Amino acid sequence: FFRNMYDKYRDAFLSHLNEYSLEEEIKEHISKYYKLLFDYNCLGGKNNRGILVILIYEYVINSSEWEKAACLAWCIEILQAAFLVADDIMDKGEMRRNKYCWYLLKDVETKNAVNDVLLLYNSIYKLIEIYLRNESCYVDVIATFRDATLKTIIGQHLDTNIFSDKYSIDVNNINVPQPVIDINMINFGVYKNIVIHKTAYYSFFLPIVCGMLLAGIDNLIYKKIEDISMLMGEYFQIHDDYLDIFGDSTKTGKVSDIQNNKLTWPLIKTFELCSEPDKIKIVKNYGKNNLACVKVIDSLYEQYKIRKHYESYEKAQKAKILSAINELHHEGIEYVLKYLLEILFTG
Amino acid sequence: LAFFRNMYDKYRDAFLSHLNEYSLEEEIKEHISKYYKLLFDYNCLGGKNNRGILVILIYEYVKNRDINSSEWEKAACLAWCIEILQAAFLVADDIMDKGEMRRNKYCWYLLKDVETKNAVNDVLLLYNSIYKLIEIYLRNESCYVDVIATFRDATLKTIIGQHLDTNIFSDKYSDAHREIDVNNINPEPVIDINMINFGVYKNIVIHKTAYYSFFLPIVCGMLLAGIDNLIYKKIEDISMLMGEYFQIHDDYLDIFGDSTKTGKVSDIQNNKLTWPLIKTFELCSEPDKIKIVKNYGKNNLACVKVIDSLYEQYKIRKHYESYEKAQKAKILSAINELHHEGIEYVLKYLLEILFTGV
Ligand SMILES: CCCCCCCCOc1cccc(COc2ccc(S(=O)(=O)N3CCOCC3)cc2C(=O)O)c1
Numbered sequence: 120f121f122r123n124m125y126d127k128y129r130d131a132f133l134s135h136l137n138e139y140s141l142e143e144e145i146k147e148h149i150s151k152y153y154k155l156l157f158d159y160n161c162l163g164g165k166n167n168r169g170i171l172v173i174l175i176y177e178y179v180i181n182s183s184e185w186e187k188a189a190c191l192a193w194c195i196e197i198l199q200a201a202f203l204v205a206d207d208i209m210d211k212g213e214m215r216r217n218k219y220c221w222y223l224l225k226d227v228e229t230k231n232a233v234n235d236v237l238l239l240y241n242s243i244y245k246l247i248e249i250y251l252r253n254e255s256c257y258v259d260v261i262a263t264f265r266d267a268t269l270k271t272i273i274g275q276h277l278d279t280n281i282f283s284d285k286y287s288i289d290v291n292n293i294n295v296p297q298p299v300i301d302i303n304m305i306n307f308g309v310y311k312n313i314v315i316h317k318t319a320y321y322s323f324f325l326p327i328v329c330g331m332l333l334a335g336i337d338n339l340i341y342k343k344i345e346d347i348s349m350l351m352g353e354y355f356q357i358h359d360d361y362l363d364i365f366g367d368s369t370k371t372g373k374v375s376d377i378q379n380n381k382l383t384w385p386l387i388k389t390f391e392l393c394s395e396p397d398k399i400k401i402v403k404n405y406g407k408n409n410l411a412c413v414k415v416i417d418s419l420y421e422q423y424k425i426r427k428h429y430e431s432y433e434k435a436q437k438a439k440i441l442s443a444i445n446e447l448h449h450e451g452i453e454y455v456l457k458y459l460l461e462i463l464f465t466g
Numbered sequence: 467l468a469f470f471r472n473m474y475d476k477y478r479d480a481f482l483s484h485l486n487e488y489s490l491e492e493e494i495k496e497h498i499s500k501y502y503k504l505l506f507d508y509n510c511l512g513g514k515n516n517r518g519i520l521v522i523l524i525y526e527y528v529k530n531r532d533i534n535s536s537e538w539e540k541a542a543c544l545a546w547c548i549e550i551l552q553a554a555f556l557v558a559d560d561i562m563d564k565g566e567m568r569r570n571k572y573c574w575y576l577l578k579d580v581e582t583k584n585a586v587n588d589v590l591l592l593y594n595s596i597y598k599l600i601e602i603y604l605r606n607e608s609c610y611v612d613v614i615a616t617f618r619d620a621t622l623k624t625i626i627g628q629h630l631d632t633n634i635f636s637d638k639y640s641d642a643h644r645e646i647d648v649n650n651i652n653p654e655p656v657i658d659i660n661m662i663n664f665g666v667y668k669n670i671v672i673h674k675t676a677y678y679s680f681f682l683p684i685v686c687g688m689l690l691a692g693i694d695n696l697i698y699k700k701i702e703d704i705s706m707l708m709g710e711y712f713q714i715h716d717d718y719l720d721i722f723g724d725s726t727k728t729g730k731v732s733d734i735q736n737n738k739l740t741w742p743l744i745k746t747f748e749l750c751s752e753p754d755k756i757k758i759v760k761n762y763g764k765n766n767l768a769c770v771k772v773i774d775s776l777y778e779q780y781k782i783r784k785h786y787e788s789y790e791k792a793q794k795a796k797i798l799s800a801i802n803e804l805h806h807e808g809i810e811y812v813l814k815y816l817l818e819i820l821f822t823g824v
């Protein structure tokens with residue numbers, strides 16, 4: 120029920136900037152721009168990560184305590200915003216949450232979007248200071264945001280570069296630019312490395328740890344939660360990979376993995392199932408901004424019944440996660456994680 | 467400078483060691499370490515290192531005292547942390563400003579093995595590495611929290627300064643009555659004569675430069691040395707003056723500087739509010755203001771030449787020499803009123819070596 124406190128946190132941060140030694144008119148331009156940056160990119164999502172903080176906190180309460188908990192929830196949503204803006208610059212996105220990517224806007228462009236990624240990212244730490252500077256968990260909380268972010272950056276790095284010629288640097292080459300798949304990297308082990316780092320830590324481990332830290336939980340439970348977070352991050356990204364091909368942009372709110380030369384679960388599954396001749400077709404057709412090329416890939420995914428293989432992967436993983444959840448021996452958190460698991464795809 | 471510079475590898479390796487702890491396949495670990503070693507080396511080294519040196523000197527001279535090797539380790543860590551921050555800012559600035567050369571070599575984002583997509587991700591990595599390093603070295607110090615807060619707050623001011631530098635002439639600031647159009651993705655850029663004044667310039671330049679280049683390094687050194695104290699406000703005022711003095715000289719170099727000497731090649735074609743522009747605008751004739759308006763902020767070399775010829779025509783170079791003398795004196799005047807021999811000594815030496823380093 121933390122949707123109502125958004126304005127407070129936004130305004131707290133905008134107030135900080137408003138204290139700057141700047142002319143009044145300039146300050147007006149600043150608040151106008153940054154009010155839009157926050158609203159445009161922090162709102163519209165399922166808010167799964169934010170809600171997770173609130174639920175964990177509650178199940179591990181006066182209105183002053185909620186203020187801290189909800190601050191941390193919105194801090195994770197602001198992190199999510201920073202990530203999506205950056206991710207859309209990097210992957211040249213078109214749409215995100217059913218509207219134009221921030222960086223594509225003529226009043227914004229790549230140059231502002233880059234600066235804005237940093238602003239959103241830093242605003243998180245200023246908010247945590249404002250609301251949590253006097254909590255004993257303060258240092259641990261900022262360290263958790265920091266470390267999860269580091270993992271995400273490394274995951275994003277691998278996702279971006281896994282098929283590049285440097286993973287198969289020339290500091291004198293600024294002239295000769297071509298995306299190709301590298302068959303050696305088309306396997307589940309590599310994929311899990313990538314997805315766990317890119318997704319699991321900030322989407323699951325972080326929000327859960329925030330709730331627990333603030334609740335006053337060193338304790339061996341933190342390790343168990345790290346392990347469950349990994350299973351969930353993988354479950355989550357594979358489902359994201361599945362929708363990229365077999366979903367409607369109307370539901371996902373975003374437009375392209377194939378033409379973007381991404382290592383995805385459907386590519387890895389197809390690759391392990393298909394004939395040698397189709398391995399050659401994939402190589403020849405993947406990662407090409409060309410209609411005929413992506414259609415070839417689409418057809419292979421249908422040919423090799425990827426829908427069916429996802430349907431049964433989902434079953435096995437959901438059972439493996441439920442089994443890891445039961446071994447936590449904490450009634451409250453177990454409930455939250457089972458609930459999260461149900462609500463994952465819809466919010 | 468020698469000691470500080472010899473400590474580089476230690477701090478880089480400590481951060482790389484942290485990434486090497488990640489649960490990744492050995493082969494991936496080796497690609498990671500190779501890429502990131504280069505990111506740090508390429509972008510962290512070859513600067514003047516004024517900001518890092520400033521941490522080291524302030525740390526030492528805040529108070530004549532015995533300082534052991536373990537204490538130095540922590541001061542050199544903070545010194546390299548500000549050099550890493552400078553590395554992050556310059557990779558980002560070169561993306562945003564369409565840089566071509568930085569420190570006499572290709573901008574990181576231009577490398578075909580890197581590109582904008584990696585550079586953006588690399589800005590965030592460099593930036594986050596600072597805090598990991600401060601944790602590795604200072605997490606047990608009482609000033610730990612204050613030190614990360616100072617990095618954070620300086621960075622926030624720098625982002626706002628960069629925002630203004632990039633947008634001061636933009637449609638959204640000029641046409642302040644109209645909201646940002648979130649449905650327009652298909653980019654008409656001109657100066658806004660209303661913004662062409664020293665008042666706006668100082669706002670921009672103090673936020674974009676002064677806080678991270680002077681205030682931050684000094685405050686780091688003093689925090690670490692063990693020092694609410696009302697002196698901070700006086701060092702903040704000195705920093706603002708030093709930041710203005712440093713940025714105006716930078717504006718000078720952008721257009722009158724020798725690229726082989728400065729190591730970089732765009733303010734005019736980027737439509738920036740610069741000191742040379744403000745100075746010409748307040749001295750030139752009416753017809754020349756209309757010429758500035760028509761030619762400024764365009765990529766066409768012939769358009770830039772028009773602006774450059776005006777700066778030659780109005781002897782802007784020489785006006786700079788005059789500003790330099792007056793400002794250096796105003797800064798020395800504020801320094802001598804600080805009443806702290808040790809810090810005054812570092813700042814005076816700083817003032818002397820600003821533009822050449824060392
Ligand atoms: C050069 C590349 C380096 C990049 C620099 C580091 C920053 C990139 O870090 C990365 C990495 C990968 C993806 C992303 C984002 O992709 C996502 C989109 C939607 C969702 S969602 O389902 O929650 N969805 C969206 C609305 O939220 C509610 C429902 C979740 C993610 C995710 O990140 O999990 C962000």
Ligand SMILES: CCCCCCCCOc1cccc(COc2ccc(S(=O)(=O)N3CCOCC3)cc2C(=O)O)c1
Nearest residue numbers: 237513514515554555558559593624625628674675679
């Ligand atoms: C990481 C977060 C990204 C978002 C924050 C703003 C985006 C970056 O935009 C920003 C912002 C601030 C500064 C900058 C860079 O401007 C500078 C270039 C060189 C020098 S230098 O001659 O000393 N340099 C240092 C080493 O000596 C070699 C010469 C000084 C500055 C300065 O302006 O101080 C670019």
